[PDB]
Write a protein that binds this ligand. Structure first.
Ligand SMILES: Nc1ncnc2c1ncn2[C@@H]1O[C@H](COP(=O)(O)OP(=O)(O)OP(=O)(O)O)[C@@H](O)[C@H]1O
Ligand SMILES: Nc1ncnc2c1ncn2[C@@H]1O[C@H](COP(=O)(O)OP(=O)(O)OP(=O)(O)O)[C@@H](O)[C@H]1O
Ligand SMILES: Nc1ncnc2c1ncn2[C@@H]1O[C@H](COP(=O)(O)OP(=O)(O)OP(=O)(O)O)[C@@H](O)[C@H]1O
Ligand SMILES: Nc1ncnc2c1ncn2[C@@H]1O[C@H](COP(=O)(O)OP(=O)(O)OP(=O)(O)O)[C@@H](O)[C@H]1O
Ligand SMILES: [Ca+2]
Ligand SMILES: [Ca+2]
Ligand SMILES: [Ca+2]
Ligand SMILES: [Ca+2]
Lengths: 285, 306, 292, 300
């Protein structure tokens, strides 16, 4: 029986979705589930290794990662477990390589910058964004308001709207206390934001209208996510988020990996899709 | 043999000049060494032995010269949560070596957490009452989790331990407060929130030894932070009111030789004390040269007592 | 009913030890107990405040601190809670001031360095320790072996025996990764080590028979000498006074004593009089609460 | 319009000297700008605009290329320059080694993992990777099968954080120290080495040096030691060739291995473009690096 470790919150019962699924028609799949916070491991270059949960130990043959491997908030650093999993040679979705490299939002943005550079604005409208290695480079902005995003954090954390020079200077003084990097980008007066996802070969576009209706995929939206899905060796599960300004201009602000939240009326379909995806990946091994 | 005095301060002020010709007991000369925290290190032995190492730029070659100070004057902030602003171990080292200081090393170490110092003012306020010691209403949050909301807006949020306006922001509403709380989570430290005061001006009452001065500061750049941007300073008369403020605060942590009390003066006529600073308070106004001389007098007298 | 918050692990049922105890003869005492890791609070300059536990909230009239307030190990920093309690103006044992100042072992040691300078080696034999603000000052050592103690940690953590120059250099390079200070001191070929404790006005001395801290060891309560009493009485005066404290010393095979540390109100209770010590602590707390 | 090359290296090597007279496509000049990570900062815009600020006066530049000779990360205070690497990539500035490999080289265990893969593929005979155990944090550090071992704490250089442990009691003391570093660590068999070897590869040039101590230290990079260049073998060529393909390709790299007294080799690490130049051919290596960079610059 093949052991699949799914790093995810307890709500979604992954064992339920993998129930009955078999590799090559007879190799059963056992599902072990737990959050990053309850895991630890030890890996040997020789191949031996063990993942400890809660305390029960297991040896996953594969891993599905649905949780953020890193957050600059307290207790959110799980990079060393990602390193350990890679060290033990365990295959995963998304790839451990992409997971590790997704641990710095500006590092992932840089990849889109390169994409934007090749494709041009009419094909890939990447939002205008500025990167600051530290607060010392934060002096002012061309226009206001702007959205400042501090360090590497999720669910709105560390993201503030700044309406003027004085406030910017204050916010910059706060970046100094985070002792990390930050970005600033034009605040978009949005009519709504859209997220284009891609799981394996399935695509879906959702329209949500400061901080849900499924729409039709377009060739434009497909290009956005197809191009983004190729970074860091390829992302099996990813999505592109863009803001649609009242003036009709689109602005791509981010690309998410395998921890992207499932949304809308089809969360069930998407989980099954992820299951189909992981089963196929496990099959090849 | 000359007594060695180490002054920890930025190079803008040349203390050697101010201590020139000052003698202890009339015949002992004072040799002044000066440097910033960033260029200092030391080693201290329980038996009394010790050495202070100072990095100096002697013509391109980064040279380290060691000294054995008999006394120390601390004019720089020993701690800041900004990168490279943590000099607490040097303060511990100086105390470990038993070096006398101004202000006392004990007070300096205990001044490394603004809310910890503020707690002393809270005690003094419960004791003296609002009429005589109008401490501002402030709330202390050990971490971001307890930052849910405020009774009134706008509020001024002060993150961790920092200076010169660093880490302080004005928040006008509930939604913005929640965003700021999420930022606090990224600083991974404590934070305080206090009522934003529409101030006519702010004032600072200082006490150097037995010399008192009060200054009023007004912004002329539309900065609610009057220490940020150009502003106007006006020295004002000392009052019994101002004197009580700095006298009572000057007694904390065993006694502060150099200290000051900052208060905001509302447009509605109400005063609000927001902080007491130690021996690293910036000299201000048009009497800075006098204050430096007052500090020499104080230090020389403290050195004589040893 | 006065509320007493006891910060300690659950192995000790403080509610039981305080059961029946009343202040002034009629005011009952309500005991709330929890570890630092399960606590949070909010304090206002106006006197308002709340301590949140686990989630249930309380308003302690007094606190007894039995847990280390600071450790450089991950998750061990509770200094902000000690600041909060002081900000809320809550009385404590030991005093919150002393607890805060005990959060840097070398800072505490510095107080003993002064006592030693006043008393003299014959009265107060403080061990020959060296303080390094950071690793850059860690070059060598007069003698070997030495014991290096990194940062601020407990129960033997971060402490290592170093036998030679080269090993010292390697260990110094590790201090660099801790990004904090460290101390070095002569390794004592100890016959045994002793701990002289003082809880209120009750004194006890125990002899324990290289880290007698780690693994199985034997304890023998020994007589208090005036010498021992002097060590703990003087150390008990630092930072405004310690209601609970103990001095640790190493006794070398050559007959010499070496004081290596004074612990505060979170000192572990040891030997066979631990129940009595808890009872002495209860008496102490009740006396303190009565005066408020 | 001369091309700007920013070299991130310490003042010792005068890179401008080595690039003097070199021109792209025959006529385009190359201006060399040099500085250490500590004296650099920058700003990058998604629109392409950007600037590098060097404390020389705070002069600012717009490198057309970058050569990185300095470690981008160290867990010692002030050794974290990862955000500058991210910044350079955000600005889309070509580099040697690739900024991608530089960023991924900021965790020794992450790189070692790559060498684990190659070992699984190649076998001990061709790729004798040392027996190493990775610990995410001090909690899994219970004991060792054999002693003595070498504990390598977190991510650091020049011997920092590396200690020899001769027994269980000492392993536990060191485990408690790791707890204080609040990071990962690895443990590996201590090798009674006759000497240790390093096989380097710069572009298409290979070299192999052997180093042995003479100051009494097991860390032969600490104290007086003797270096001796030796002959390249196909065994060595395989080592550096295989590792040079990781993270999209390493322009400059080397594989370090220990040669036990029992005759066995043990590979312990692969370094990137900030590997120190050793031996009697440092001038030649700096020249090979100039050629490599000139070529890379030519292609852009
Ligand atoms: N530049 C901008 N202009 C206007 N609104 C913005 C901008 N950037 C972000 N927002 C708004 O803030 C929301 C959250 O921003 P962002 O997606 O960066 O946060 P996040 O922490 O990555 O979110 P989550 O983790 O919930 O995916 C966006 O959905 C959008 O509504
Ligand atoms: N609650 C407040 N309401 C109104 N203005 C405020 C408030 N708090 C601070 N300010 C303004 O900002 C200035 C700086 O604030 P504060 O003194 O707290 O910062 P700081 O970092 O300690 O600065 P410095 O080191 O210059 O003392 C005050 O002098 C005042 O002008
Ligand atoms: N200099 C020394 N020479 C010899 N043995 C020593 C020395 N320092 C410490 N030890 C031994 O190690 C034990 C624990 O060391 P120490 O008390 O410094 O550690 P700790 O972390 O404070 O421990 P605990 O929290 O148990 O008090 C001592 O009781 C003694 O047995
Ligand atoms: N397992 C081991 N057994 C024996 N000697 C070892 C072992 N690991 C390292 N050494 C010795 O220590 C030296 C330095 O170790 P290592 O290369 O791990 O350190 P480093 O910090 O990466 O140093 P550098 O950056 O100079 O490469 C090696 O050259 C070798 O002589
Ligand atoms: Ca998002
Ligand atoms: Ca102030
Ligand atoms: Ca102890
Ligand atoms: Ca190496």
């Amino acid at each position: 029986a093949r052991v699949l470790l799914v790093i995810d919150e307890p709500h979604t019962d992954w064992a339920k979705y993998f129930k009955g699924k078999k590799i090559h028609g007879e190799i059963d799949i056992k599902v072990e589930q737990a959050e990053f916070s309850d895991l630890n491991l030890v890996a040997h270059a020789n191949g031996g290794f063990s993942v400890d949960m809660e305390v029960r130990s297991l040896k996953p043959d594969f891993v599905l990662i649905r949780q953020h491997a890193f957050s600059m908030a307290r207790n959110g650093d799980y990079r060393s477990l990602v390193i350990g999993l890679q060290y033990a040679g365990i295959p995963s979705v998304n790839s451990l390589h992409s997971v590790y490299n997704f641990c710095d939002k500006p590092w992932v943005f840089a990849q889109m910058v390169r994409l934007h550079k090749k494709l041009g604005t009419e094909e890939f409208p990447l939002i205008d964004q500025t990167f600051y290695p530290n607060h010392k480079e934060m002096l002012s902005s061309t226009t206001y308001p702007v959205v400042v995003k501090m360090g590497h954090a999720h669910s709105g954390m560390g993201k503030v709207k700044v309406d003027n020079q004085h406030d910017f200077q204050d916010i910059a003084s706060v970046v100094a206390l985070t002792k990390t990097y930050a970005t600033a980008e034009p605040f978009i007066d949005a009519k709504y934001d859209v997220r284009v996802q891609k799981i394996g070969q399935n695509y879906k576009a959702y329209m949500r209208t400061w901080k849900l209706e499924q729409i039709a995929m377009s060739d434009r939206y497909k290009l956005w996510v197809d191009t983004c899905s190729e970074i860091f060796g390829g992302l099996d599960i990813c999505a592109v988020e863009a803001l649609h300004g009242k003036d009709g201009r689109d602005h791509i602000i981010e690309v998410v990996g395998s921890s992207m939240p499932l949304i809308g009326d089809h969360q069930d379909e998407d989980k099954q899709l992820i299951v189909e995806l992981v089963v196929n990946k496990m099959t090849q091994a």
